[PDB]
Design a protein around this ligand. Sequence first.
Ligand SMILES: *[C@@H]1O[C@H](CO)[C@@H](O[C@@H]2O[C@H](CO)[C@@H](O[C@@H]3O[C@H](CO)[C@@H](O)[C@H](O[C@H]4O[C@H](CO)[C@@H](O)[C@H](O)[C@@H]4O)[C@@H]3O)[C@H](O)[C@H]2NC(C)=O)[C@H](O)[C@H]1NC(C)=O
Ligand SMILES: *[C@@H]1O[C@H](CO)[C@@H](O[C@@H]2O[C@H](CO)[C@@H](O[C@@H]3O[C@H](CO)[C@@H](O)[C@H](O[C@H]4O[C@H](CO)[C@@H](O)[C@H](O)[C@@H]4O)[C@@H]3O)[C@H](O)[C@H]2NC(C)=O)[C@H](O)[C@H]1NC(C)=O
Ligand SMILES: *[C@@H]1O[C@H](CO)[C@@H](O[C@@H]2O[C@H](CO)[C@@H](O)[C@H](O)[C@H]2NC(C)=O)[C@H](O)[C@H]1NC(C)=O
Ligand SMILES: *[C@@H]1O[C@H](CO)[C@@H](O)[C@H](O)[C@H]1NC(C)=O
Ligand SMILES: *[C@@H]1O[C@H](CO)[C@@H](O)[C@H](O)[C@H]1NC(C)=O
Ligand SMILES: *[C@@H]1O[C@H](CO)[C@@H](O)[C@H](O)[C@H]1NC(C)=O
Length: 740
Amino acid sequence: SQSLYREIHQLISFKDVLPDKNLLPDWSSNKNPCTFDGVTCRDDKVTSIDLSSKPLNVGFSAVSSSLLSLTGLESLFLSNSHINGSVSGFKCSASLTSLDLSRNSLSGPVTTLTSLGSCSGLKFLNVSSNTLDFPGKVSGGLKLNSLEVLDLSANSISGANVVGWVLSDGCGELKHLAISGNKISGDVDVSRCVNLEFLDVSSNNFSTGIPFLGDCSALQHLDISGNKLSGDFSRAISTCTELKLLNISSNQFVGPIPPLPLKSLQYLSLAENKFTGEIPDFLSGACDTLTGLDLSGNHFYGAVPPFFGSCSLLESLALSSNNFSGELPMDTLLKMRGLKVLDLSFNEFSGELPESLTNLSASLLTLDLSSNNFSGPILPNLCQNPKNTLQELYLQNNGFTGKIPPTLSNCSELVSLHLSFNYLSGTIPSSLGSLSKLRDLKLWLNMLEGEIPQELMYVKTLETLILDFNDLTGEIPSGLSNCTNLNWISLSNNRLTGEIPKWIGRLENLAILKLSNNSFSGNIPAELGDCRSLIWLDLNTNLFNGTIPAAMFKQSGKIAAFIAGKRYVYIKNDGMKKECHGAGNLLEFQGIRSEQLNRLSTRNPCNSRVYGGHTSPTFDNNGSMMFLDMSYNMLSGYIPKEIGSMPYLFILNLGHNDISGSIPDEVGDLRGLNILDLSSNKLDGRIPQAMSALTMLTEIDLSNNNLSGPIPEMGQFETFPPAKFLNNPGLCGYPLPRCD
Ligand SMILES: *[C@@H]1O[C@H](CO)[C@@H](O[C@@H]2O[C@H](CO)[C@@H](O[C@@H]3O[C@H](CO)[C@@H](O)[C@H](O[C@H]4O[C@H](CO)[C@@H](O)[C@H](O)[C@@H]4O)[C@@H]3O)[C@H](O)[C@H]2NC(C)=O)[C@H](O)[C@H]1NC(C)=O
Ligand SMILES: *[C@@H]1O[C@H](CO)[C@@H](O[C@@H]2O[C@H](CO)[C@@H](O[C@@H]3O[C@H](CO)[C@@H](O)[C@H](O[C@H]4O[C@H](CO)[C@@H](O)[C@H](O)[C@@H]4O)[C@@H]3O)[C@H](O)[C@H]2NC(C)=O)[C@H](O)[C@H]1NC(C)=O
Ligand SMILES: *[C@@H]1O[C@H](CO)[C@@H](O[C@@H]2O[C@H](CO)[C@@H](O)[C@H](O)[C@H]2NC(C)=O)[C@H](O)[C@H]1NC(C)=O
Ligand SMILES: *[C@@H]1O[C@H](CO)[C@@H](O)[C@H](O)[C@H]1NC(C)=O
Ligand SMILES: *[C@@H]1O[C@H](CO)[C@@H](O)[C@H](O)[C@H]1NC(C)=O
Ligand SMILES: *[C@@H]1O[C@H](CO)[C@@H](O)[C@H](O)[C@H]1NC(C)=O
């Protein structure tokens, strides 16, 4: 036939316009397209093409001209295919049923989509994750009332009543409308869309009316989350008898939980609003079907009602960041046969942990009790129940006393263990070495004693070891060398001894090493220079000595930084108190209230400058050290000129050592430098004029040295007070007295 002749010539013309033709190596002239990778055939005819996640790097016009006009083509999948340009008029086969152009670079007004009316059989359209917008006046209509499924999410569509524009020429056929992640506002009226099953208008700019749903006869999924809505959503959905998922989270709803349609409800989220009061008894009506409940981040209080025992299907219950109280309602929890995630964090539950909690160890995946006022010991009998499934145990920021139950080694599925901010005494059980899947061990701010267990070597998966603020002793166990995936080691504020092992150069995943305020000693191992992920090195307040090895900077410019997305807290030191040392403590802060930072004050001579966030380096490839504090040690000799080879270095603290020689002119290359402390050393010579080039300095200290001659007049030096240059006899020039 001709369509066969035409099919093959159309496919190859397309292949030929690709900048990297090597992309479709088995597509070739004089070969049957039904044997081509990417192609689906039925009865020797092409029915589908899927070139998704291939970087075609071509424009839509190539697509519409070569592919969309193919006789008999039923679907075209081109997600994440580096297609750019915009849609416009073309000839389109009548059999084309589905078009997926998601995750591309289509641009232009969303009205360009109207030209897909050419495709008279088009029922499913995905253009999510592009840059389609809506310039100015919202008039006319999209004119694609034949669609069953339309996804316009994650575009650049900003405007009022864009939804009216989509539905203007009818929506009797529409089953699924998604338009989340834009900047759309105004009215949402889908009452004429009597077949609509799925509506997602989340993460937009709605702040007026609640969506009008009319009879709401087929609606199963309603997501209006991530807006600024308030008002009577209860009345709006009261007719929705088929509703399975209702997500109204992250809005501005206030008041108690109002009536809800419960007979079909599987997932409910009211999280991150301003709801008040107690959980009402009438919610028992969903217990036949409810699968997920989320009430987090409101102002709820009281206790978890008894009726929840009948919710035998409830898999996850999240109630964090409210004000629930009383004891852990074990009587109710134990009936929840299907429960898998339990999150009561950031409330005021109190009392000791009930013995019966040991049964849940066999059903739960996540147990999060962090940031409550629990007291007593961690259940020793925990994970007795053979076939322990528990993966995540979060008990941080409570009032637990006693030992860390070695028993915890029986929860053999554990990937994450956070017992920080408690009053735990005793040792770190050697048996934790058994947790062969453990990635995160966080035990900081307790009273743990004894040595860091050698047996940790048995945990190949270990990524974070956070042991700060305890009473630990002994040396860094050689065993940790086997833990090659470690990316965050924090041992500060203990009483550890010995040297930094040279095997540390072996850990090529290690981004953060914090060992401040201990009694570590000897030389800084040149081997640190071998760590290719290292961006945060804190050794302040120890007994280190020898000279700073030039080699430790060999990675500069070669660093790519698995460390991001972890909640941290950075407590900046004010030079006000002399007992307070270092630039500042970077600390892990998952599941802990900042209000409880005051717990540190019995363990920390530091008075109040707090920087929150989630870890997030600034480069992605070819960066360098970002933080280097080696202050308050006994380092000597001169500063290597390779010190200047770190353009991402925000902070440099070498204060309070015995460093001598002159300041290398290469310090002037540290263009990202915010802080520079070299105070209380034996540095001499001149401040290099090269340092006039730095533009990001917020703090400098060069006081208590033997520096001499004039302070550089250009750059930022005139900006700092005399105090920063005191006790340098040969030193003159503003902010000091003019030079003789
Ligand atoms: C319109 O297009 C967008 C963009 O493609 C699309 O959104 C994406 O949908 C997919 C699912 O189709 C999402 O990817 C999933 O992510 C979850 C975890 O968040 C994974 O568990 C899923 O993996 C499953 O399936 C895989 C096979 O593909 C298996 O290998 C795996 O074992 C799992 O079984 C799955 O990858 C994706 O996150 C979204 N979001 C994006 C990319 O923005 C959207 O659904 C389309 N719209 C319509 C109406 O179809
Ligand atoms: C390195 O580690 C050691 C070990 O933590 C650390 O020494 C400790 O410092 C803290 C903080 O300065 C000290 O806390 C004190 O505890 C005594 C009782 O032992 C209290 O009487 C003191 O209370 C004062 O401060 C309170 C408010 O913070 C006031 O309410 C009260 O009225 C007092 O003014 C004080 O809190 C702790 O004693 C020491 N412990 C040891 C072992 O010395 C050291 O500071 C760390 N070094 C650095 C540079 O951080
Ligand atoms: C309920 O809606 C919330 C809020 O939109 C969802 O949480 C967000 O998920 C999006 C991606 O869809 C993320 O970009 C946001 O960071 C999330 N926000 C918050 C505050 O968590 C949530 O996933 C929805 N629940 C369900 C089951 O769909
Ligand atoms: C589309 O992508 C190509 C390849 O980078 C580029 O050269 C071209 O200018 C782009 N077209 C538009 C409309 O920006
Ligand atoms: C959201 O809508 C309001 C009112 O229409 C408008 O003034 C504002 O610019 C929009 N805000 C955002 C985040 O675009
Ligand atoms: C939270 O609950 C406690 C205990 O019932 C109560 O005393 C306290 O006032 C509540 N907190 C707030 C902020 O209302």
